[PDB]
Structures are given as structure tokens and as C-alpha cells.
Coordinates of C-alpha atoms in Angstrom, one line a residue:
Chain A
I1 CA -26.1 -32.1 -20.1
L2 CA -25.4 -31.3 -23.8
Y3 CA -28.9 -32.0 -25.1
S4 CA -30.3 -30.2 -22.0
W5 CA -28.0 -27.2 -22.8
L6 CA -29.2 -27.2 -26.4
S7 CA -32.7 -26.9 -24.8
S8 CA -31.7 -24.1 -22.4
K9 CA -33.3 -20.7 -21.5
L10 CA -30.4 -18.2 -21.3
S11 CA -27.8 -18.5 -24.0
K12 CA -28.2 -18.4 -27.8
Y13 CA -29.7 -22.0 -28.3
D14 CA -33.2 -23.4 -28.9
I15 CA -35.1 -26.7 -28.7
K16 CA -37.5 -26.0 -31.5
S17 CA -34.9 -25.2 -34.2
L18 CA -32.6 -28.2 -33.6
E19 CA -35.4 -30.9 -34.2
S20 CA -35.7 -30.4 -38.0
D21 CA -52.4 -17.7 -12.8
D22 CA -51.8 -21.1 -14.6
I23 CA -48.3 -22.6 -13.9
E24 CA -46.1 -23.7 -16.8
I25 CA -44.5 -27.1 -17.5
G26 CA -41.6 -26.4 -20.0
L27 CA -38.1 -27.7 -20.1
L28 CA -36.5 -25.6 -17.4
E29 CA -32.7 -25.0 -16.7
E30 CA -32.8 -26.6 -13.1
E31 CA -33.0 -30.1 -14.6
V32 CA -29.5 -29.7 -16.0
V33 CA -27.6 -28.9 -12.7
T34 CA -28.2 -32.3 -11.0
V35 CA -26.2 -34.1 -13.7
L36 CA -23.2 -31.8 -13.4
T37 CA -22.2 -33.1 -9.9
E38 CA -23.1 -36.8 -9.6
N39 CA -22.7 -38.4 -13.0
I40 CA -19.8 -36.4 -14.7
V41 CA -17.4 -36.7 -11.7
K42 CA -17.1 -40.5 -11.9
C43 CA -16.2 -40.9 -15.6
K44 CA -12.7 -40.0 -16.8
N45 CA -11.4 -38.7 -20.1
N46 CA -14.8 -36.9 -20.7
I47 CA -13.6 -33.6 -22.3
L48 CA -16.7 -32.1 -24.0
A49 CA -18.8 -32.6 -20.9
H50 CA -16.1 -30.9 -18.9
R51 CA -15.9 -28.0 -21.4
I52 CA -19.6 -27.4 -21.4
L53 CA -19.7 -27.7 -17.6
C54 CA -17.1 -24.9 -17.5
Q55 CA -18.7 -22.6 -20.0
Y56 CA -22.1 -22.3 -18.3
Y57 CA -20.7 -21.4 -14.8
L58 CA -17.9 -19.2 -16.5
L59 CA -19.8 -16.3 -18.1
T60 CA -22.7 -16.2 -15.6
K61 CA -21.1 -14.1 -12.9
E62 CA -18.7 -16.8 -11.5
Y63 CA -14.9 -17.1 -11.9
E64 CA -14.3 -19.7 -9.1
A65 CA -16.6 -22.8 -9.3
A66 CA -15.1 -23.8 -12.7
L67 CA -11.5 -23.8 -11.3
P68 CA -11.6 -27.5 -10.1
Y69 CA -12.6 -28.9 -13.6
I70 CA -10.1 -26.7 -15.6
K71 CA -7.1 -28.5 -14.1
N72 CA -9.0 -31.7 -14.5
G73 CA -10.0 -30.8 -18.1
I74 CA -6.2 -30.5 -18.7
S75 CA -5.5 -33.8 -16.9
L76 CA -8.2 -35.7 -18.8
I77 CA -6.8 -36.2 -22.4
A78 CA -3.2 -34.8 -21.9
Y79 CA -2.5 -37.9 -19.8
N80 CA -4.6 -40.1 -22.1
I81 CA -2.6 -38.9 -25.2
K82 CA 0.0 -41.7 -24.7
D83 CA -2.2 -44.9 -24.5
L84 CA -5.0 -43.7 -26.9
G85 CA -3.3 -41.3 -29.4
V86 CA -5.5 -38.5 -30.8
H87 CA -4.9 -35.0 -32.3
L88 CA -5.3 -31.9 -30.2
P89 CA -5.1 -28.6 -32.3
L90 CA -8.2 -27.0 -30.7
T91 CA -7.3 -28.0 -27.1
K92 CA -4.8 -25.1 -26.6
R93 CA -7.4 -22.5 -27.9
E94 CA -10.5 -23.1 -25.8
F95 CA -8.5 -23.6 -22.6
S96 CA -6.7 -20.3 -23.4
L97 CA -10.1 -18.7 -22.9
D98 CA -11.2 -21.0 -20.1
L99 CA -8.1 -21.0 -17.9
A100 CA -6.9 -17.4 -18.1
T101 CA -10.2 -15.5 -17.8
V102 CA -10.8 -17.1 -14.4
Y103 CA -7.6 -15.5 -13.1
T104 CA -8.0 -12.2 -15.0
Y105 CA -11.3 -10.9 -13.6
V106 CA -11.6 -12.7 -10.3
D107 CA -8.2 -11.6 -9.0
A108 CA -8.5 -8.0 -10.2
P109 CA -4.9 -6.8 -9.8
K110 CA -3.0 -10.1 -9.6
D111 CA -2.9 -12.7 -12.4
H112 CA -3.6 -10.8 -15.6
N113 CA -0.9 -12.3 -17.7
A114 CA -1.6 -15.9 -16.7
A115 CA -1.5 -17.4 -20.3
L116 CA 1.9 -15.8 -21.3
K117 CA 2.7 -18.2 -24.2
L118 CA -0.9 -19.6 -24.7
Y119 CA -2.2 -16.4 -26.3
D120 CA 1.0 -16.4 -28.4
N121 CA 0.0 -19.9 -29.5
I122 CA -3.4 -19.0 -30.9
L123 CA -2.3 -15.5 -32.3
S124 CA -0.4 -16.5 -35.4
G125 CA -2.6 -17.2 -38.4
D126 CA -5.9 -15.7 -37.3
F127 CA -4.8 -12.4 -35.7
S128 CA -6.1 -13.5 -32.2
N129 CA -9.2 -14.9 -30.6
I130 CA -12.0 -13.7 -28.3
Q131 CA -9.6 -14.5 -25.4
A132 CA -6.7 -12.4 -26.9
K133 CA -8.9 -9.4 -26.5
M134 CA -10.8 -10.4 -23.3
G135 CA -7.6 -11.4 -21.4
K136 CA -5.1 -9.1 -23.1
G137 CA -7.6 -6.2 -22.9
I138 CA -6.7 -5.4 -19.3
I139 CA -3.0 -5.9 -20.2
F140 CA -3.2 -3.1 -22.8
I141 CA -6.0 -0.9 -21.4
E142 CA -6.2 -0.9 -17.6
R143 CA -2.4 -1.1 -16.7
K144 CA -1.8 1.6 -19.4
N145 CA 0.5 0.7 -22.3
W146 CA -0.4 2.9 -25.3
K147 CA 1.5 1.3 -28.3
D148 CA -1.0 -1.3 -29.5
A149 CA -3.8 -0.3 -27.0
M150 CA -4.7 2.8 -29.2
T151 CA -4.7 1.1 -32.6
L152 CA -5.6 -2.6 -32.0
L153 CA -9.1 -2.5 -30.7
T154 CA -10.9 -4.2 -33.6
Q155 CA -8.7 -7.2 -33.5
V156 CA -12.0 -9.1 -32.8
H157 CA -12.8 -8.9 -36.5
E158 CA -12.0 -12.5 -37.6
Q159 CA -14.3 -14.2 -35.1
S160 CA -17.1 -11.9 -34.5
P161 CA -17.3 -8.3 -36.0
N162 CA -20.9 -7.5 -34.9
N163 CA -20.6 -8.3 -31.1
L164 CA -22.2 -5.6 -29.0
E165 CA -19.4 -4.5 -26.5
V166 CA -16.1 -5.4 -28.2
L167 CA -16.6 -3.1 -31.2
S168 CA -17.4 -0.2 -28.8
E169 CA -14.0 -0.5 -27.0
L170 CA -12.4 1.4 -29.9
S171 CA -12.8 4.8 -28.2
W172 CA -14.1 3.9 -24.6
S173 CA -10.7 3.5 -22.9
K174 CA -8.9 5.5 -25.6
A175 CA -10.8 8.7 -24.6
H176 CA -7.9 10.9 -23.4
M177 CA -6.4 11.6 -26.8
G178 CA -9.3 13.4 -28.6
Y179 CA -11.9 10.9 -29.8
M180 CA -14.5 11.7 -27.1
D181 CA -17.7 12.3 -29.2
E182 CA -16.8 9.2 -31.2
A183 CA -16.5 7.2 -28.0
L184 CA -19.9 8.5 -26.8
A185 CA -21.4 7.4 -30.1
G186 CA -19.8 4.0 -29.8
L187 CA -21.0 3.4 -26.3
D188 CA -24.5 4.4 -27.5
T189 CA -24.2 1.7 -30.1
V190 CA -23.3 -0.8 -27.4
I191 CA -26.2 0.1 -25.0
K192 CA -28.9 -1.6 -27.1
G193 CA -28.8 -5.1 -25.5
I194 CA -30.4 -6.4 -22.3
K195 CA -31.9 -3.3 -20.6
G196 CA -33.1 -5.5 -17.6
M197 CA -34.6 -4.8 -14.2
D198 CA -32.9 -7.4 -11.9
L199 CA -29.7 -8.4 -10.1
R200 CA -28.4 -10.8 -12.7
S201 CA -29.1 -8.9 -15.9
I202 CA -29.0 -5.2 -15.0
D203 CA -25.4 -5.3 -13.6
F204 CA -24.2 -4.7 -17.1
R205 CA -26.4 -1.6 -17.4
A206 CA -25.4 -0.3 -14.0
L207 CA -21.7 -0.6 -15.0
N208 CA -22.5 1.1 -18.3
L209 CA -24.1 4.0 -16.3
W210 CA -20.6 4.6 -14.9
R211 CA -18.9 3.8 -18.3
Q212 CA -20.8 6.4 -20.3
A213 CA -21.0 9.0 -17.6
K214 CA -17.3 9.2 -17.4
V215 CA -17.1 9.8 -21.2
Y216 CA -19.8 12.4 -20.9
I217 CA -17.8 14.2 -18.2
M218 CA -14.7 14.0 -20.3
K219 CA -16.1 15.3 -23.6
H220 CA -16.5 18.9 -22.2
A221 CA -12.8 19.6 -21.8
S222 CA -10.9 18.4 -24.9
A223 CA -14.3 24.7 -22.8
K224 CA -18.1 24.9 -22.8
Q225 CA -20.2 23.9 -19.7
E226 CA -23.1 22.3 -21.5
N227 CA -22.4 18.6 -21.1
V228 CA -20.8 19.3 -17.6
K229 CA -24.2 20.2 -16.1
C230 CA -26.1 17.6 -18.2
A231 CA -23.8 14.8 -16.9
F232 CA -25.9 14.5 -13.7
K233 CA -28.5 12.4 -15.6
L234 CA -26.0 9.6 -16.3
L235 CA -24.3 9.7 -12.8
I236 CA -27.6 9.8 -10.9
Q237 CA -28.9 6.9 -13.0
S238 CA -25.8 4.9 -11.9
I239 CA -27.0 5.1 -8.3
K240 CA -30.5 3.8 -9.1
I241 CA -30.7 0.8 -11.4
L242 CA -28.6 -1.8 -9.4
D243 CA -28.8 -1.2 -5.6
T244 CA -25.6 0.4 -4.3
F245 CA -22.8 2.0 -6.4
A246 CA -19.9 3.9 -4.7
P247 CA -17.9 5.1 -7.8
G248 CA -20.7 7.4 -8.9
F249 CA -20.3 10.2 -6.3
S250 CA -16.6 9.6 -5.8
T251 CA -15.6 9.9 -9.5
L252 CA -17.5 13.2 -10.1
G253 CA -17.0 14.6 -6.6
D254 CA -13.8 16.4 -7.4
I255 CA -15.2 17.2 -10.9
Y256 CA -17.8 19.5 -9.2
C257 CA -15.0 22.1 -8.3
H258 CA -13.6 22.5 -11.9
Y259 CA -15.7 24.9 -14.1
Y260 CA -18.8 25.7 -12.1
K261 CA -16.7 25.6 -8.9
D262 CA -19.7 24.1 -7.0
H263 CA -18.1 23.1 -3.7
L264 CA -21.4 23.2 -1.7
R265 CA -22.5 19.7 -2.8
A266 CA -18.8 18.6 -2.9
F267 CA -19.4 18.4 0.9
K268 CA -22.5 16.3 0.2
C269 CA -20.7 14.1 -2.4
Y270 CA -18.3 12.5 0.1
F271 CA -21.0 12.6 2.8
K272 CA -23.1 10.5 0.4
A273 CA -20.0 8.3 -0.4
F274 CA -19.8 7.5 3.4
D275 CA -23.0 5.4 2.9
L276 CA -21.2 3.1 0.3
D277 CA -17.5 3.1 1.3
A278 CA -15.4 6.0 0.0
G279 CA -12.1 4.1 0.2
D280 CA -10.3 6.3 -2.4
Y281 CA -7.9 9.2 -3.1
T282 CA -10.3 12.2 -3.0
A283 CA -12.7 11.4 -0.1
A284 CA -10.1 11.1 2.6
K285 CA -8.1 14.2 1.6
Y286 CA -11.3 16.2 1.5
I287 CA -12.7 14.8 4.8
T288 CA -9.4 15.9 6.4
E289 CA -9.4 19.3 4.7
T290 CA -12.8 20.3 6.2
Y291 CA -12.6 18.7 9.7
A292 CA -8.8 19.3 10.4
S293 CA -9.1 22.9 9.4
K294 CA -12.0 23.5 11.8
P295 CA -9.9 22.6 13.8
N296 CA -11.2 19.1 14.8
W297 CA -8.8 16.1 14.4
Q298 CA -11.0 13.6 16.2
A299 CA -13.2 13.2 13.1
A300 CA -10.0 13.0 11.0
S301 CA -8.9 10.0 13.1
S302 CA -11.9 8.1 11.8
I303 CA -10.5 8.3 8.2
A304 CA -7.5 6.2 9.4
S305 CA -9.8 3.1 9.6
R306 CA -10.1 3.1 5.8
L307 CA -7.2 5.4 4.5
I308 CA -4.2 3.1 4.6
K309 CA -6.2 -0.1 5.7
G310 CA -7.5 -0.5 2.1
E311 CA -4.5 -2.5 1.1
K312 CA -5.0 -2.0 -2.7
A313 CA -5.0 1.8 -1.9
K314 CA -1.3 1.8 -0.9
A315 CA -0.1 1.3 -4.5
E316 CA -1.3 4.7 -5.8
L317 CA -0.6 6.6 -2.5
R318 CA 3.2 6.1 -2.1
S319 CA 4.2 8.9 -4.5
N320 CA 3.5 11.7 -2.0
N321 CA 3.3 11.6 1.8
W322 CA -0.4 12.8 2.1
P323 CA -2.0 9.7 3.5
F324 CA 0.6 9.2 6.3
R325 CA 0.4 12.7 7.8
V326 CA -3.5 12.4 8.0
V327 CA -3.3 9.3 10.2
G328 CA -0.1 10.4 12.0
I329 CA -1.1 14.0 13.0
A330 CA -4.5 12.7 14.2
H331 CA -2.6 10.9 17.0
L332 CA -0.4 13.9 18.0
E333 CA -3.0 16.4 19.3
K334 CA -5.0 13.5 20.9
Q335 CA -1.9 12.9 23.1
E336 CA -0.5 9.4 22.4
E337 CA 3.0 10.1 21.2
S338 CA 4.3 6.6 20.9
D339 CA 2.2 5.8 17.8
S340 CA 3.3 9.0 16.0
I341 CA 6.8 7.8 15.1
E342 CA 6.1 4.8 12.8
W343 CA 3.8 6.7 10.4
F344 CA 6.4 9.5 10.3
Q345 CA 9.1 6.9 9.4
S346 CA 7.2 5.8 6.3
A347 CA 6.4 9.5 5.5
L348 CA 10.1 10.3 5.8
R349 CA 11.0 7.4 3.5
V350 CA 8.4 8.6 1.0
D351 CA 9.2 12.4 1.2
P352 CA 12.8 13.4 2.1
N353 CA 12.4 17.1 1.5
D354 CA 9.7 18.1 3.9
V355 CA 9.1 20.1 7.1
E356 CA 5.8 18.7 8.7
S357 CA 7.1 15.1 8.4
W358 CA 10.3 16.0 10.3
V359 CA 9.2 18.8 12.6
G360 CA 6.1 16.8 13.5
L361 CA 8.2 13.7 14.2
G362 CA 10.6 15.9 16.2
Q363 CA 7.7 17.1 18.3
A364 CA 6.9 13.5 19.2
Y365 CA 10.6 12.9 19.9
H366 CA 10.6 16.0 22.1
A367 CA 7.5 14.9 24.0
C368 CA 8.5 11.2 24.3
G369 CA 11.9 11.7 25.9
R370 CA 14.4 11.5 23.0
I371 CA 15.5 15.2 23.1
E372 CA 19.0 14.4 21.6
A373 CA 17.3 13.1 18.5
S374 CA 15.0 16.2 18.3
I375 CA 18.1 18.4 18.1
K376 CA 19.4 16.3 15.2
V377 CA 15.9 16.4 13.5
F378 CA 15.1 20.1 14.0
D379 CA 18.5 21.3 12.8
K380 CA 17.9 19.2 9.7
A381 CA 14.7 21.1 9.1
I382 CA 16.9 24.2 9.2
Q383 CA 19.2 22.5 6.7
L384 CA 16.3 21.3 4.4
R385 CA 13.9 24.3 4.4
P386 CA 16.0 27.4 3.9
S387 CA 15.3 29.1 7.2
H388 CA 12.3 27.8 9.1
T389 CA 11.2 30.0 12.0
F390 CA 9.4 27.5 14.3
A391 CA 12.2 24.9 14.2
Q392 CA 14.6 27.4 16.0
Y393 CA 12.2 27.9 18.9
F394 CA 11.6 24.1 19.3
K395 CA 15.3 23.5 19.1
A396 CA 16.0 26.3 21.6
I397 CA 13.6 24.6 24.0
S398 CA 15.3 21.3 23.3
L399 CA 18.7 22.8 24.0
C400 CA 17.4 24.2 27.3
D401 CA 15.7 21.0 28.5
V402 CA 19.0 19.1 28.1
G403 CA 20.9 22.0 29.8
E404 CA 23.2 23.6 27.1
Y405 CA 23.0 27.4 26.7
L406 CA 25.8 27.3 24.1
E407 CA 23.9 28.2 20.9
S408 CA 20.6 29.3 22.7
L409 CA 22.0 32.9 22.8
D410 CA 22.8 32.8 19.0
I411 CA 19.7 30.9 17.8
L412 CA 17.3 33.3 19.7
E413 CA 19.0 36.3 18.0
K414 CA 17.5 35.5 14.6
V415 CA 14.1 34.5 16.0
Chain B
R1 CA 0.9 23.5 36.4
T2 CA 0.0 25.1 33.1
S3 CA 2.1 24.8 29.9
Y4 CA 2.5 26.7 26.6
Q5 CA 1.6 24.5 23.6
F6 CA 1.1 25.5 19.9
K7 CA -0.4 23.1 17.3
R8 CA -1.1 23.7 13.5
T9 CA -3.2 25.6 10.9
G10 CA -5.1 22.7 9.2
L11 CA -4.4 20.6 6.1
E12 CA -0.6 20.6 5.5
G13 CA -0.2 23.4 8.1
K14 CA 3.5 23.9 8.5
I15 CA 3.4 26.0 11.7
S16 CA 0.9 28.9 11.5
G17 CA -2.3 28.5 13.6
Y18 CA -2.4 27.2 17.2
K19 CA -4.4 26.4 20.3
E20 CA -3.2 25.8 23.9
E21 CA -3.6 23.1 26.6
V22 CA -2.9 22.2 30.2
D23 CA -1.3 19.0 31.7
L24 CA -1.2 17.3 35.1
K25 CA 0.4 14.1 36.4
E26 CA 2.1 12.8 39.5
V27 CA 4.4 15.7 40.7
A28 CA 7.2 18.1 39.8
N29 CA 9.8 17.0 37.2
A30 CA 12.8 15.8 39.2
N31 CA 14.7 12.6 39.9
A32 CA 15.1 13.3 43.7
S33 CA 11.5 12.3 44.5
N34 CA 10.9 9.7 41.7
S35 CA 9.7 11.0 38.2
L36 CA 9.6 7.6 36.5
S37 CA 8.0 9.4 33.5
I38 CA 10.8 9.5 30.9
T39 CA 10.3 13.2 30.0
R40 CA 12.4 14.6 32.9
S41 CA 14.8 17.5 33.4
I42 CA 18.5 16.5 32.8
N43 CA 20.7 18.2 35.5
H44 CA 24.3 19.2 35.2
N45 CA 25.7 16.2 37.1
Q46 CA 25.6 13.1 34.9
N47 CA 28.1 11.1 32.8
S48 CA 27.6 9.3 29.5
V49 CA 26.3 6.2 31.3
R50 CA 27.4 5.5 34.8
Chain C
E1 CA 3.1 -10.6 22.6
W2 CA 3.2 -13.4 19.9
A3 CA 6.1 -15.3 18.4
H4 CA 5.2 -16.7 15.0
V5 CA 7.5 -19.3 13.3
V6 CA 8.6 -18.0 9.8
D7 CA 9.0 -21.0 7.5
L8 CA 12.0 -19.6 5.5
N9 CA 10.6 -20.8 2.2
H10 CA 8.7 -17.5 1.2
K11 CA 9.9 -14.1 -0.1
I12 CA 8.6 -10.6 -1.0
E13 CA 10.9 -9.8 -4.0
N14 CA 10.3 -6.0 -4.1
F15 CA 13.4 -5.0 -2.1
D16 CA 14.0 -1.7 -4.1
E17 CA 10.7 -0.1 -3.0
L18 CA 9.8 -2.4 0.0
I19 CA 12.2 0.0 1.8
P20 CA 10.8 3.3 0.5
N21 CA 13.9 5.3 1.4
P22 CA 17.4 4.8 0.1
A23 CA 18.6 2.9 3.1
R24 CA 21.4 0.4 2.1
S25 CA 22.1 -2.0 -0.8
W26 CA 25.3 -4.1 -1.2
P27 CA 27.1 -5.6 -4.3
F28 CA 27.3 -9.0 -2.6
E29 CA 23.9 -10.7 -2.6
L30 CA 22.2 -11.3 0.8
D31 CA 20.2 -14.4 1.8
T32 CA 16.4 -14.4 1.2
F33 CA 15.4 -15.0 4.9
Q34 CA 17.7 -12.3 6.1
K35 CA 16.2 -9.7 3.7
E36 CA 12.9 -10.8 5.4
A37 CA 14.4 -10.0 8.7
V38 CA 15.2 -6.5 7.5
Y39 CA 11.6 -6.2 6.3
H40 CA 10.3 -7.3 9.7
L41 CA 12.6 -4.7 11.3
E42 CA 10.9 -1.7 9.5
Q43 CA 7.4 -2.8 10.6
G44 CA 8.0 -2.2 14.3
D45 CA 8.0 -5.7 15.7
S46 CA 11.0 -7.3 17.5
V47 CA 13.4 -10.0 16.1
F48 CA 15.3 -13.1 17.1
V49 CA 18.2 -14.5 15.0
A50 CA 19.0 -18.2 15.4
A51 CA 21.9 -18.7 12.9
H52 CA 25.6 -19.5 12.7
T53 CA 28.7 -17.3 12.8
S54 CA 30.7 -16.6 9.7
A55 CA 27.6 -16.8 7.5
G56 CA 26.2 -13.3 7.2
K57 CA 24.8 -12.6 10.7
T58 CA 25.8 -8.9 10.3
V59 CA 22.8 -8.4 8.0
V60 CA 20.7 -7.5 11.1
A61 CA 23.7 -5.5 12.5
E62 CA 23.9 -3.6 9.2
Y63 CA 20.2 -2.4 9.2
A64 CA 20.2 -1.9 13.0
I65 CA 22.2 1.4 12.5
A66 CA 21.0 2.1 8.9
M67 CA 17.3 2.2 10.0
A68 CA 18.2 4.0 13.3
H69 CA 20.4 6.6 11.6
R70 CA 17.8 7.7 9.0
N71 CA 14.8 7.4 11.4
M72 CA 16.8 9.1 14.2
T73 CA 17.0 6.5 17.0
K74 CA 20.2 4.9 18.6
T75 CA 21.6 1.4 18.9
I76 CA 23.6 -0.5 21.5
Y77 CA 25.7 -3.5 20.5
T78 CA 26.1 -5.6 23.7
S79 CA 28.8 -8.3 23.8
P80 CA 29.9 -10.1 27.0
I81 CA 33.6 -10.3 26.0
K82 CA 35.7 -7.2 25.7
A83 CA 37.8 -8.3 22.8
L84 CA 34.6 -8.9 20.8
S85 CA 33.5 -5.3 21.6
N86 CA 36.8 -4.1 20.1
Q87 CA 36.4 -6.4 17.1
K88 CA 32.8 -5.4 16.2
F89 CA 33.8 -1.8 16.8
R90 CA 36.5 -2.2 14.1
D91 CA 33.9 -3.9 11.9
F92 CA 31.5 -1.0 12.3
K93 CA 34.3 1.5 11.4
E94 CA 35.1 -0.6 8.3
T95 CA 31.8 -1.6 6.6
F96 CA 29.6 1.5 7.3
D97 CA 30.0 4.9 5.5
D98 CA 30.6 7.6 8.0
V99 CA 28.8 6.5 11.2
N100 CA 29.4 7.9 14.8
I101 CA 30.5 4.8 16.8
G102 CA 31.5 4.5 20.5
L103 CA 32.9 2.0 23.0
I104 CA 32.7 2.2 26.9
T105 CA 35.7 1.2 29.0
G106 CA 36.5 1.5 32.7
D107 CA 38.7 4.6 32.4
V108 CA 36.5 6.7 30.1
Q109 CA 34.3 6.4 27.0
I110 CA 35.9 6.5 23.5
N111 CA 33.9 9.0 21.3
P112 CA 31.6 10.8 23.9
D113 CA 29.0 11.9 21.4
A114 CA 28.5 8.5 19.6
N115 CA 25.4 7.5 17.8
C116 CA 26.2 3.7 18.0
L117 CA 27.6 2.9 21.5
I118 CA 29.2 -0.5 22.3
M119 CA 29.4 -1.9 25.9
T120 CA 29.7 -4.9 28.2
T121 CA 26.6 -6.7 29.6
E122 CA 27.7 -5.4 33.1
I123 CA 28.0 -1.9 31.7
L124 CA 24.5 -2.3 30.1
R125 CA 23.0 -3.4 33.4
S126 CA 24.6 -0.2 34.8
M127 CA 22.2 1.9 32.8
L128 CA 18.9 0.5 34.2
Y129 CA 20.1 0.9 37.8
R130 CA 22.0 4.2 37.5
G131 CA 19.7 6.1 35.1
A132 CA 21.8 6.6 31.9
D133 CA 21.6 9.1 29.0
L134 CA 21.3 6.5 26.2
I135 CA 18.2 4.5 27.3
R136 CA 16.1 7.5 26.2
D137 CA 17.7 7.6 22.7
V138 CA 18.0 3.9 22.0
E139 CA 15.0 1.9 20.6
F140 CA 16.5 -1.3 19.0
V141 CA 19.2 -2.8 21.2
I142 CA 21.4 -5.5 19.6
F143 CA 22.3 -8.6 21.8
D144 CA 25.4 -10.6 20.9
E145 CA 25.5 -14.4 21.4
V146 CA 22.4 -15.5 23.4

């Protein structure tokens, strides 16, 4: 396990230094894995072996398989502290990295602040740890809280100043203020690392090819259209090195209509995103805008399968009532008026001051049978929107269908 | 047998453009024959409930 | 057509924006499982309360109208006893903030243009056979004491 890890073939260790057409026969990594299941599981209070077991599976594209032996890792000596009695100053600092990073990146939106007081424990004398930048990075950067997120990005200084990626974070995420060229420079300084051509190694490069591309795209604005046209090389490279990458066309799809105003390949951008997934803000709204304005709402109904169904998509879509009318109005013209109402309820909840959400719902109410409700609804669209013309005709018809010709004489005067 | 219907313009089309349709099902809208379809003409001979 | 058993030991504690509209919120704190009932109401599925009287059974009755009044449907409270009809009518007058309530008797209906009607089970039955006005307009019918 430990000796065999010292003689590994991935991480920064070596067999030769520690001593002091034709198949090979060297000390491979596959000899190690057999000991990590059978032998280690039987013995109790075996902490270093547990730690090393965790660390290999942890950083190598897995935040899941280490989970069983983190809880155990805690159990091992924390229980044994009574009947043996030994110091534990460094126990709360490695398991700060080991425990929290499993929950941070695996569950992408959920358990970010899993440590809570465990990062507060290490961050006292030494101004943090690799974990208080790895785990607390997404706390400061991704969720957006620009108090310490702007300034404190080289709080990785005490442990490791010359690590490749962590020093480049200074201006990557903080690229909306002004430091764009600087960010680009930094990212260039972080590129020189692996540069692989495989599934395991080249993911980092693939994800850089989105990372830097965004920066490149940004640097133009905060006038000239030099690095707007030249951005293609970084975006096109993104969809190339790995295998499949959806955010390439989707991120720069709406960007194509800014300065050049090239809306010809904006059609091809989200047609290309249909290959990957395109479960996002732009693609749906666009796909509706072309097909529904034809008019042709049958193709707009296909967007409902991935518009609200995304689950994580609902968090950033509840400000406006744009995703509810796309799915709702698709059902209206196809003639199934029972399904119409529920969508329009949510839309109403979202947007109180609106015509199409109410008048569209009132059309369904009209067609279903609830004509008494349609009077209430349509007259509220006269109350909300200063004086809507189509609401008076719809209401007039609804007055007629019931039987009352009381205000039908007065309402049809203005129309 | 025909019916006047008017739809929408396009994206966020608050009543502008339109296209018409035709419908056909069962018979004339009246409770004398049957008309179990809920969309039916309310006559001037009905109380709140009874 | 399915009837899942809710364990009553779980909660979605986002009540401010779980209901996206400003529906209703009281100074007195409701029970956790009865907030879940309200949550289930807004989805579209039906409900079934197996509780005790004098222990906040009106939580469902509160959001029966409050959902229907915003979303523009109607509601029928159906009690077998006539006294109870009067009682819960009074209750509806009291707790709610400006709601059009009604009650059907033999002679004639109190409040002809009511949003929330009240009636006897016999009188309810006399909608489905006669062909009443308010079986179009009503979506969520309340049933008292099953």
C-alpha cells in the first residue's frame, strides 16, 4: 500500500530516489489495488492506510468511492482516543480536505458549506489550507459574494505559492471588474501542465478550452471587434480535444448577435447544441422565437421535454414567466385545454402584471366551460393593462354565451 | 359547422396575428338532445343550483 | 390513480417562495405536515385529511379558497348537518379577508353571486342530476367529515 504508492506511476513520487514490440516488467500500479479491499478492511484503528486509501481515489476523477472510509477514518482513532490516549492536532486538518471536497464537487449545487467550523479550525495561525481555497472557492466564487472573493485569491501562499492553477484564479473568476488582459495572461501561465491526448488527462485541457475562451470573449467589451472574431479558435478547440462539450456553442451562441450581429449561424449554434443537450436559458427561448413565429408551435412543444424538466434549470428561470408560456401556449393551439391551466397558474404566480398569462388562461377557461371565471379574468386584464382591445371582444363573447346583454351594448361601443 | 378563431403573432404575441380553424363533434349545442360536452349554451331558465 | 403514504417526518422549508404568489401567511405557526398538504394542493393532485377536530383542520379549508380565488376557480364546502353549514359560513366570514361566500337553503340562496358556496350533501347531489351552474366553475370541492 504505502511502499507501493511510493513506487507509483502517476503522482509526484519515485522508487529510484527513495532507496538512497518487447513487453515491459516494471512495478505497475495494478499491484496496489488488490490490497485496498481484502487486507485493510479487517484491521481496525489503521489511520494512515485509510488516509492513503482515500487520497488516491479522491483526486483521480472520483468523489464517491472514498465516502465509506471517511466516516470510518473518523471512527478509527476518535473512538480509540479513550483506551489508548494519543494526540490529534493534524487529524482535523487532513479530514477537512478529505471530507468536505467529496460533498463540494460531487453534489454540484447542494453541500458546498459542509465543513462549517472545520475550515474555521485550520484557518487561524496559517491563513488557511489547500482546502480553505478548494472548498471555500465555490463559496466565494460561484455563488457570488464579492467581499473577500475579489481580494483573497492568493491565500494559497503559505502552503504552495507555485502551484499551476490556484495562482491563476486571481483574475479568472474576477474578470467582470476590469482585469481581463491580466486574467488572460494568468490563464496562459496555468496552461503549461499536462497537455494530454486521452480521456483521463485531457479533461483538464478541455475545461480550460472553455475557461480561457470565455475570458477571450469578455476582453473585447471592457469596443473593438478584433478578439471577438479571433475567439472562434478557442471555442472550436473546446469541441475537439475531449469528445463532446455542450457549453461551447451555448455560451457563445447569444454572443454572435452582439457586435457583428451574425444571426445566420446563431440558428446553426443551437441546431448544433441539439446534438449535445442545450438544456439552458438561450437555446429554448431561441428555438421558440423561430418556430413559434413561423407560425409552428408543434416544434415548440418539443422544447417542453427539456425546458422545465431540467430541475436545476428552475432556479434561474423563476424571475420572469418566459419558460411557462413556451410550454403552456404550445398546448393551446394543439387543442388540449385541460393541461393549459396549471402552467398558467405558475406563470400568474411569477408575473402578476401580464396580459398573455391571464388572457391566455382566460381563453382556456372560455373553451373548457368556466365562462364565469373568464369574465373575472378578462375584466382584470382591462384593469391591469390600461385598455386592452382583444379582452373586450373575448369578454363580450363570454357575456353572450352566458346570456347577459347588459354591458355587451356598452363594451362593444369602445371596440 | 365552421367557427371564427384567432390565435397569436409569435414569441410573446399579445394578440396581433391570427389563423382560423374548424370544429366538429356530436351535434348542435343544446341540453334538449344531450350535449354532455361541458361547453354548452346556458339558456334563460335556470336557477343557482336546482 | 395512485395513493402514496406520506411519512409526516419530512419537510420542504422554503414556504416563502414555494408558493410563488403572495397567497396567505398567518402570525400563528402552522404544523409541518399541513404546510405539505398546501404544497400538494398547488401541484394539481387530490388530497385526503385524516386528522382530529380542534387541531388546525382549517389549514386545507384556508388554502382551498385562497388558491381558487387567485387562480380563478370556485369551491364548495359540503357538510351533512345544516348547523355546521351556518357555523363554517360564519368562520369563513371571520378568518378570510373580503371573500364572496354563499349558503343554499330551501327557500332561496343567501348571496346569489357567491364565489365560495356552502350546501348540504343532498343539495350537492342535486347538482349532478339537475345540471347546476357551479359544477362548471368548481375544481376543488371540500368534503366535511368522511
